[PDB]
């Protein structure tokens, strides 16, 4: 079960379907795994 | 390979490109890779059709698994 | 978004035909599958469940080696 | 070229037309079979004259049912038996107005209390015996324990009063099941009540009949012979209980809100 | 026009609202308060559908379409040309459907019978309200409902189905389809049996109830009975409608992955 | 409220009924009838007896051979393990031959078992057809149940034998599974451009919806007048009582026209049969006459046309 | 004629209490709106 | 022809007494719950 | 003009009091739910406006949670 | 205007007490469930707010779990 | 304080046995529901790996580690 | 009505109230233990 509420992104004309659906609790697992690495200072 | 992708395939990776970290993410062996799937164990005189199993890489359907 | 995916397909084929599969001579038996071929690259090898790998932070511009 | 066209006419098109014509034609035949009962209809004219009309499409030609055990022939569409003698007064002076009963509404045979005029013969089994009979004539039946035997219980009547007591069960031999309960009323007559208008409470040992009131059980129609029932009598009994759904209390026919 | 036997049943009373003012017939129809309401709302809805076709690109019957608002309107009020017409029509539709059910209740009360038909109609109404009210409210926007157009609500159905990669693996969807299929089978057998018993082989008498029981006990070994097949019928149709409503309230509000991945709870039981 | 007539409150038993007498020269009926209390809460309580003659034994030998074959191949696909069989049961199936074999008879583990199971299932259903016909005709009844059964058999043979032969491949037929046959359904819609633009598919959906509507309406109406003896339809047909009169007034007042107690059963018959007739017509034309249903619908002025605003470049044209 | 069975005295009684109750209800509504205006004015 | 419940005037008085007492107690408990919630997590 | 509304109390001799009471009560409950839902879906919404403070954001930045999340990188 | 609510107790001679009681009870239970679900779906949610502490995060950073995860690498 | 006196008459209009059964069934359903709602949140107590993770503890036993070493 | 007299109703009420009080006591105890172990507010 994915209990409500959700986040929906519309990606097309109205009344056509065409939208992406996110569960905030599942998307947190993808956010909690990215970890951009830290910069390395430019070289002389 | 990384130089080739970053220069010659911008129709796909447009000006963001890739580094090692895009796949290794700090480990020597990447996490999500694949090989040619043999399928479940069946009798020796039975050839594989390549479907009708659980199918973990095709979103758990009964579709062709490789 | 259908037009980048079209290029992505071709890109992945390049990575696997020119670079990764010919490495099957160099790697040990640990990095191979049941049929004796090395691990290869998918869409999931860099996206890992996001619409752009790492949400599209441009890391590769800072390094002229890539 | 993605959407190039070679020829406009194809087979799918023709076949679709053929289907439109094959429907559109079973509608015709079914609508004609629909009019073997109740027709020709009566159209009321500009100043009250009534004529017989027949509709669109027209009525079919009569067919015959041959009933078993020399039960006669039935032609349909055919003649009708004569209505009985209902009295009604119209409420508003136009053809589409409603009617009011003239006397006591319970004993009038109009509205939900109307009934049909069927044969004066019982319904038969495949062997020729009467179908609905009391459980003392059908000597092989038994109530399954695990179920409340209604014989003995009382017949509370929708206003809380007592109607009488259950004394017999009437069964159906062609399909084994209960059809009627027989009860002795307040004036010591034997009357029937259909089992589909009874709520049976085993622990209270009551039968609740929400249709009519307690005093109303004295005027339920009676049978000729108590070893069988005919089609006409079934209709009369059931219709009397159905009249109470609108006439028992003077407030029942009077707009909820 | 009246049938041969109709006059003795046309009495007054039995109504819910109104009273003696709307208690008449027009031709064969019975009107009532809710009859006036239903025709009012049906006429208004139809005329608004036609106007929404007039301001569109074509009056071809197959290509008319009136669409709901965008998802950015939320549960608010959209402009007339970009969604508000859809909202007015969807109010008219609810008004008309409920009026229809209550008129049925008035008629059944007048004729002295049970309220089984309006009760079964209530479940169709419930499925419609699930698709236009409950699911949109739980997801947070009117623009999750379907547009009004032949061929154009089918594009909605298709894309919504593919938002879950494979909608055949939805469990309540499987259960509802089971009920639909079994209902068509049962209706074919019931129709055939009654026709066969009153239209026997040439030069024979009408058969009886014993014949009806015998035929199915010979073929299959069990016969359900002449009153229980009507029950079985009400049951299968109502259940089809019910599980359709459930399957749509599950999709989006309570499950956002692919539908094949739900079923994964079964081979992951720790018992094989 | 008032009793709704959904369950039987009081049950009664008499000795079992053996059945209407058959014509002389018939076999006896097999089995001693038993009674079910739970089945009696909702319907008739007797189970059995049963009639097994010549055609219903050949059927039941064919069908069980087919079932043994299907079950054993599903079981060989997991390596004979019954634990895995129960674990992954909805994903298993028996698959048709590879399409490159055409209409030849392929080797046994590459599609020949599918072919065997299909042949035996076919024979089973045709023998059952003959049984149904003879059973209804020996009791002196009309044979209306055989006509509808014939329609259903024809749909089973169309998708499965006739269309694969007209296409030139057995690999165009469904497999024997649960999720596998659902996958077949989706794939054949995807390959031939969207079944929603197939017009026979739309008409059969019209008639399936209509079957549900009509049977809710009829089941309701007869339960609502069963207090006036309406569940006994044969007598209401051959001697119209007040139950039939009320039943037909209800619909006349509500929607302006009505049927009779016998005619509504013809409406039922036809609504159940047109569904499958359109099923046959829609499958038989797919692939053999029409290759893309959406392009067909566009050519005949049926599909809507959403506004564009953008331009996408087909990379095969560049 | 449509009638409710109440006499004229019973109707007078019912009317008295009905009007009192409706006035009290509207008083409570006004109070709620004054509080809401003090907290979050909308016009 | 007039709506009645079969209760006399004494029975109605009795019912009314207990009904009002119960409703007052219930509303008291509601007020207490809201005071605690405001102290913990104020929402306006 | 002051004697125009004298017979008003006779209203309850043609309109049923019990039906009217039930209708009023049910309508008021339905309208209460509707107006609350309409105001919650506007700029006047008072549950999600993060006034007087945002509580999810308050929980993400507690010192204990921050110190645990820092020790998760190392 | 202070003795205006005298005959109020007569209400139960025209409204059925048992029906009213059942209606009130059922409505109150439904409303309780509904308001709890509406407040849980907002910023006021009190189960997932990680106050007074996040417990899953607390379990991921226990020294024993950290030392076992290190010993794998 | 003596204003709840006739309260015991409640059981002369409400059936005691039906009420008892209703209460019991409702309480069981609510118990299951609240346990499942709390298990699906940050307060979950079965999978939080407190006071220790046991699957992880089994993967790093010296015997299992030495056997996994011998297979590569 | 329910068929209970006034004496039977008094008896039932006595035991019902005692049982409900005991049940609520156990609930409070469970919550005190849970607050000591894992406070949620
Ligand atoms: C790619 C798309 C997916 C798919 C996506 C969906 C989606 C999305 C939906 C379904 C829904 C359904 N699908 Mg599916 N479905 C697929 C494949 C199938 C297949 C098949 C053989 O493959 C079948 C058999 C079904 C069958 C079904 C039913 C279970 C259900 C539709 C019945 C219904 O909603 O009744 C309910 C009845 C109504 C909504 C009717 C309302 C009636 C109103 C009240 C009365 C109107 C009167 C009118 C205005 C009056 C006109 C009067 C004139 C005078 C005559 N689907 C494919 C895989 N399916 C639908 C559903 O379950 O919704 C609840 C749904 O939304
Ligand atoms: C910025 C918006 C404001 C807000 C602005 C308003 C305004 C303005 C009003 C309300 C009103 C109400 N609000 Mg508010 N309200 C807000 C947030 C809330 C929240 C919440 C979870 O946030 C809730 C649960 C409520 C709930 C309520 C109800 C108590 C009341 C509607 C009653 C009704 O429908 O009677 C209809 C049902 C009947 C009439 C049936 C008859 C019942 C009889 C009369 C007895 C019932 C008693 C009743 C519950 C009142 C209790 C008072 C007692 C003396 C304690 N509001 C926010 C904070 N709210 C209305 C009100 O209070 O009316 C007096 C009102 O005018
Ligand atoms: C931030 C929000 C606060 C919160 C703010 C509020 C507010 C504000 C209120 C509640 C109320 C309730 N809350 Mg709370 N509540 C929170 C978290 C919880 C959690 C949880 C799992 O986290 C649960 C299980 C509860 C459960 C409850 C119920 C005890 C009660 C609703 C009763 C009802 O629906 O009557 C419906 C049923 C009936 C009316 C039937 C009546 C039966 C008779 C009268 C006796 C039954 C007794 C009943 C159990 C009440 C307790 C009395 C006893 C002394 C125990 N809350 C969070 C922390 N909660 C309401 C309340 O307590 O009112 C008193 C209330 O006003
Ligand atoms: C972090 C959260 C906590 C947690 C916080 C709470 C809180 C808070 C409560 C519970 C309550 C319960 N918890 Mg706990 N609980 C946790 C983990 C568990 C686990 C587990 C496997 O993890 C289980 C199996 C349980 C099981 C239980 C039940 C014993 C009890 C619910 C009773 C019920 O539903 O009666 C419903 C059924 C009826 C009312 C029917 C009638 C029952 C009659 C009276 C006889 C039954 C006996 C009774 C159940 C036991 C009586 C005590 C005896 C003297 C032993 N909890 C975790 C550790 N749990 C509740 C409780 O203790 O109630 C007193 C409670 O308030
Ligand atoms: C709209 C307009 C311009 C209005 C102007 C006219 C004015 C001014 C007023 C007229 C008055 C009123 C109030 C009219 C309302 C009616 C209007 C206008 C429209 C409604 C018409 C309507 C909804 C019809 C739809 C009909 C359809 C498509 C039905 C679908 C199902 C179907 C095909 C059924 C056929 C089979 C039938 C007839 C089933 C009924 C039936 C069943 C189900 C039994 O079980 C049964 C059992 C025993 C005996 C008889 C029966 C029986 O007849
Ligand atoms: C005239 O009366 C009739 C009979 O009585 C004489 C019949 O026996 C019969 C034969 C009917 C039967 C033997 C019963 C047929 C049984 C069916 C279709 C079973 C379906 C019922 C279910 C509950 C299965 C559905 C369950 C899930 C989806 C889970 C008919 C058709 C009839 O019309
Ligand atoms: C009975 C079926 C539903 C019961 C479950 C209700 C539980 C949860 C529902 C709440 C989930 C809603 C979706 C949240 C995510 C989408 C964003 C949203 O809308 O959620 C909030 C709204 O919640 C809202 O309506 C809340 C409104 C809920 C009221 C439900 C009561 C129905 C009764 C009406 C009967 C007449 C925030 O609103 P805003 O962003 O300020 O609005 C802006 C736009 O709407 C208009 O410009
Ligand atoms: C010396 C050899 C001894 C053989 C002696 C027996 C004679 C042959 C069978 C008798 C027979 O052909 O009888 C028929 C049996 O049909 C049947 O097997 C029909 C089944 C025969 C074929 C079985 C295999 C099926 C073939 C493929 C499918 C055909 C599909 C056609 C369907 C339309 C009809 O059966 P009944 O009318 O119920 O019986 C009544 C009396 O005859 C006996 O009580
Ligand atoms: C044929 C079976 C048809 C069952 C009807 C569909 C129930 C959907 C789940 C609803 C639960 C929920 O509110 O949400 C569940 C959600 C959807 O999916 C999930 O998280 C589910 C996680 C696991 C739950 C699986 C239990 C299945 C039990 C159903 C009955 C027996 C089979
Ligand atoms: C372990 O189990 C044991 C062995 C113990 C037995 C248990 C059996 C079990 C559990 C079985 C489970 C079965 C299941 C789930 C079956 C699922 C079946 C489904 C849903 C099937 C759906 C569709 C299949 C169709 C429509 C097939 C149609 C095939 C046809 C019409 C075949 C035609 C072939 C013909 C007529 C033969 C021509 C051959 C020839 C010789 C003429 O070619 C030249
Ligand atoms: C066949 C599998 C692949 C598919 C279908 C695919 C598809 C896509 C799509 C559609 C985008 C555009 C995303 C958007 O604009 O929303 C994208 C972006 C991107 N992909 Fe992939 N991809 C695949 C494999 C890969 C691989 C293997 C890598 C790493 C080597 C990669 C690296 C990227 C990067 C870096 C971007 C972002 C480029 C930008 O900012 O526009 N992709 N991919
Ligand atoms: C001449 C006196 C009568 C006036 C004509 C009646 C007009 C009826 C009002 C329109 C419909 C009412 C709107 C809501 C109906 C109920 C919704 C289910
Ligand atoms: Ca290259
Ligand atoms: Ca706030
Ligand atoms: Ca918290
Ligand atoms: Ca733990
Ligand atoms: Fe029938
Ligand atoms: Mg397949």
UniProtKB/TrEMBL annotation, chain B:
Heme b 3 binds at residues 12, 16. Ca(2+) binds at residue 4. This is Photosynthetic reaction center cytochrome c subunit. The chain holds residues 133 to 198 of 396 of the full protein. Heme 4 binds at residue 12. The reaction center of purple bacteria contains a tightly bound cytochrome molecule which re-reduces the photo oxidized primary electron donor. Binds 4 heme groups per subunit. Heme b 2 binds at residue 24. Heme 2 binds at residues 20, 23-24.
From TrEMBL, chain C:
It comes from the Bacteria. Heme b 2 binds at residue 31. Heme 4 binds at residues 43, 46-47. Ca(2+) binds at residues 14, 18. Heme b 3 binds at residues 1, 47, 52. Heme b 4 binds at residues 6, 10. Binds 4 heme groups per subunit. The reaction center of purple bacteria contains a tightly bound cytochrome molecule which re-reduces the photo oxidized primary electron donor. This is Photosynthetic reaction center cytochrome c subunit. It comes from Thiorhodovibrio frisius. The chain holds residues 265 to 330 of 396 of the full protein.
UniProtKB/TrEMBL annotation, chain F:
GO terms for biological process: photosynthetic electron transport in photosystem II. The chain crosses the membrane at residues 50-76, 113-133, 145-166, 203-225, 267-290. GO terms for cellular component: endomembrane system; plasma membrane light-harvesting complex; plasma membrane-derived chromatophore membrane. The keyword Transferase does not apply. Pfam families: Photo_RC. The gene is pufM. This is Reaction center protein M chain. It comes from Thiorhodovibrio frisius. Belongs to the reaction center PufL/M/PsbA/D family. InterPro entries: Photo_II_D1/D2_sf (IPR036854), Photo_RC_L/M (IPR000484), Photo_RC_L/M_CS (IPR055265), Photo_RC_M (IPR005781). Reaction center is composed of four bacteriochlorophylls, two bacteriopheophytins, two ubiquinones, one iron, and highly hydrophobic polypeptide chains. It is found in: Cellular chromatophore membrane; Endomembrane system. Fe(3+) binds at residues 218, 233, 265. It is a multi-pass membrane protein.
From TrEMBL, chain L:
The keyword Transcription regulation does not apply. It is a single-pass type II membrane protein. Residues 7-41 form the Antenna complex alpha/beta subunit domain. GO terms for molecular function: bacteriochlorophyll binding; metal ion binding. A bacteriochlorophyll binds at residues 13, 31. InterPro entries: Antenna_a/b (IPR000066), Antenna_beta_dom_sf (IPR023624), LHB-1/5 (IPR002362), Light-harvesting_complex (IPR035889). SUPFAM superfamilies: Light-harvesting complex subunits. This is Antenna complex alpha/beta subunit. It comes from Thiorhodovibrio frisius. The gene is pufB1.
């Amino acid at each position: 079960c994915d209990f409500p509420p959700q986040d929906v992104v519309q990606t097309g004309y109205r009344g056509l379907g065409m939208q992406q659906n996110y569960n905030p609790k599942l998307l947190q697992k993808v956010i909690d795994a990215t970890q951009v690495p830290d910069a390395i200072p430019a070289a002389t | 390979m990384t130089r080739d992708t970053n220069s010659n395939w911008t129709g796909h990776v447009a000006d963001t490109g890739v580094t090692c970290y895009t796949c290794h993410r700090g480990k020597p062996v990447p996490e999500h890779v694949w090989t040619t799937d043999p399928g479940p164990d069946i009798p020796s005189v039975f050839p594989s059709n390549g479907q009708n199993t659980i199918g973990y890489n095709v979103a758990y359907t009964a579709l062709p698994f490789d | 978004k259908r037009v980048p995916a079209w290029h992505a397909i071709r890109n992945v084929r390049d990575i696997n035909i020119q670079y990764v599969e010919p490495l099957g001579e160099v790697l040990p038996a640990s990095r191979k599958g049941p049929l004796g071929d090395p691990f290869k690259v998918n869409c999931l090898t860099c996206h890992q469940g996001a619409y752009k790998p790492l949400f599209g932070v441009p890391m590769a511009k800072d390094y002229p080696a890539l | 070229e993605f959407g190039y066209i070679t020829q406009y006419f194809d087979l799918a098109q023709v076949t679709l037309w053929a289907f439109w014509l094959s429907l559109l034609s079973v509608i015709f035949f079914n609508r004609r079979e629909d009019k073997r009962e109740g027709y020709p209809q009566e159209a009321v004219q500009i100043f009250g004259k009534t004529i017989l009309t027949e509709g669109f499409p027209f009525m079919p030609a009569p067919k015959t049912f041959k009933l078993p055990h020399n039960g006669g022939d039935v032609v349909k569409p055919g003649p009708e038996r004569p209505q009985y003698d209902f009295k009604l007064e119209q409420v508003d002076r136009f053809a589409g107005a409603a009617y009011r009963p003239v006397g006591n509404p319970m004993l009038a045979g109009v509205g939900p209390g109307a009934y049909a005029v069927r044969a004066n013969k019982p319904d038969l089994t495949n062997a020729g015996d009467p179908r609905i009979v009391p459980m003392r004539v059908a000597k092989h039946f038994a109530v399954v324990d695990k179920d409340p035997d209604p014989r003995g219980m009382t017949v509370i009547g929708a206003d809380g009063q007592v109607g009488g007591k259950v004394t017999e069960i009437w069964v159906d031999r062609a399909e084994p099941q209960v059809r009627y309960l027989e009860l002795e009323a307040g004036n010591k007559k034997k009357v029937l009540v259909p089992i589909a208008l009874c709520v049976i409470k085993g622990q209270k040992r009551e039968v609740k009949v929400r249709s009519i009131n307690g005093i109303h059980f004295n005027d339920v129609p009676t049978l000729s012979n108590y070893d069988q029932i005919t089609l006409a009598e079934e209709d009369k009994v059931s219709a009397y209980y159905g009249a109470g759904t609108l006439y028992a209390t003077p407030n029942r026919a009077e707009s909820v809100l | 026009a009246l049938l041969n036997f109709e006059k003795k049943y046309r009495v007054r009373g039995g109504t819910l609202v109104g009273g003696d003012l709307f208690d008449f017939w027009v031709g064969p129809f019975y009107v009532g308060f809710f009859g006036v309401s239903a025709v009012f709302f049906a006429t208004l809805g139809t005329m608004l559908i036609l106007f929404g076709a007039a301001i569109g690109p074509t009056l071809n019957i197959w290509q008319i379409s009136i669409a709901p608002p965008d998802l950015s309107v939320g549960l608010g009020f959209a402009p007339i040309r970009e969604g508000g017409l859809w909202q007015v029509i969807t109010i008219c539709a609810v008004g008309a459907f409920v009026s229809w059910a209550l008129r049925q209740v008035e008629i059944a009360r007048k004729l002295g019978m049970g309220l089984h038909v309006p009760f079964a109609f209530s479940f169709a109404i419930l499925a419609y309200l699930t698709l236009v009210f409950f699911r949109p409210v739980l997801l947070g926007a009117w623009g999750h409902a379907f547009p009004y157009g032949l061929f154009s609500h089918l594009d909605w159905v298709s894309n919504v189905g593919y938002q879950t990669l494979h909608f055949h693996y939805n469990p309540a969807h499987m259960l509802a389809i089971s009920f639909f299929f079994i209902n068509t089978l049962a209706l074919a057998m019931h129709g055939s049996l009654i026709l066969s018993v009153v239209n026997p082989q040439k030069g024979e008498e009408v058969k009886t109830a014993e014949h009806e029981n015998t035929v199915f006990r010979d073929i299959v070994g069990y016969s359900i009975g002449a009153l229980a097949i009507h029950r079985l019928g009400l049951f299968l149709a109502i259940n089809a409608a019910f599980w359709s409503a459930v399957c749509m309230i599950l999709t989006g509000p309570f499950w956002t992955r692919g539908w094949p991945e739900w079923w994964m709870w079964w081979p992951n039981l720790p018992i094989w | 409220p008032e009793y709704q007539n959904i369950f039987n409150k009081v049950q009664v038993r008499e000795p079992a009924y053996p059945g209407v007498e058959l014509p002389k020269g018939s076999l006896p009926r097999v089995g001693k009838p038993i009674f079910s209390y739970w089945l009696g809460k909702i319907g008739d309580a007797q189970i059995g007896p049963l009639y097994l003659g010549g055609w219903g034994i050949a059927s039941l030998i064919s069908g069980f051979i087919a079932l043994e074959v299907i079950g054993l191949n599903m079981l060989a696909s997991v390596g004979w393990d019954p634990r895995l069989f129960l674990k992954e049961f909805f994903w298993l199936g028996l698959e048709p031959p590879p399409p490159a074999y055409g209409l030849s008879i392929p080797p046994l583990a590459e599609g020949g078992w599918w072919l065997i199971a299909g042949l035996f299932l076919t024979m089973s259903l045709l023998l059952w057809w003959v049984r149904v016909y003879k059973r209804a005709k020996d009791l002196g009844m009309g044979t209306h149940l055989s006509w509808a059964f014939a329609v259903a058999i024809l749909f089973f043979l169309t998708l499965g034998f006739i269309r694969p032969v007209l296409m030139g491949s057995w690999g165009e037929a469904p497999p024997f599974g649960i999720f596998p046959h659902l996958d077949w359904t989706a794939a054949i819609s995807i390959r031939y451009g969207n079944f929603y633009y197939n017009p026979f598919h739309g008409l059969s959906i019209a008639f399936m919806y209509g079957s549900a509507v009509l049977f809710a309406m009829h089941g309701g109406t007869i339960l609502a007048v069963s207090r006036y003896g309406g569940d006994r339809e044969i007598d209401q047909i051959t001697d119209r009582g007040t139950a039939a009169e009320r039943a037909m007034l209800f619909w006349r007042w509500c929607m302006g026209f009505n049927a009779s107690m016998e005619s509504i059963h013809r409406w039922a018959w036809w609504f159940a049969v047109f569904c499958i007739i359109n099923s046959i017509l829609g499958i038989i034309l797919t692939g053999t006459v029409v290759d893309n249903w959406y392009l067909w619908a566009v050519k005949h002025g049926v599909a809507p046309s959403y506004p564009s605003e953008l331009t996408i470049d087909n990379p095969y044209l560049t | 004629k449509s009638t409710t069975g109440l006499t004229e005295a019973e109707s007078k009684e019912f009317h008295g209490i009905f009007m009192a109750s409706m006035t009290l209800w509207f008083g409570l509504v006004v109070l709620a709106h004054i509080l809401s205006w003090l907290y979050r004015p909308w016009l | 022809e007039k709506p009645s419940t079969g209760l006399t005037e004494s029975e109605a008085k009795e019912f009314h007494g207990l009904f009002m007492a119960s409703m007052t107690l219930w509303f008291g408990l509601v007020v207490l719950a809201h005071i605690l919630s405001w102290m913990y997590r104020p929402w306006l | 003009n002051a004697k125009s509304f004298d017979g008003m109390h006779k209203l309850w001799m043609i309109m049923n009091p019990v039906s009217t009471l039930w209708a009023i009560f049910i309508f008021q409950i339905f309208l209460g739910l509707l107006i609350h839902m309409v105001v919650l879906s506007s700029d006047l919404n008072w549950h999600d406006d993060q006034i007087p403070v945002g509580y999810q954001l308050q929980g993400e930045t507690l010192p204990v949670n921050l110190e645990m999340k820092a020790a998760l990188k190392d």
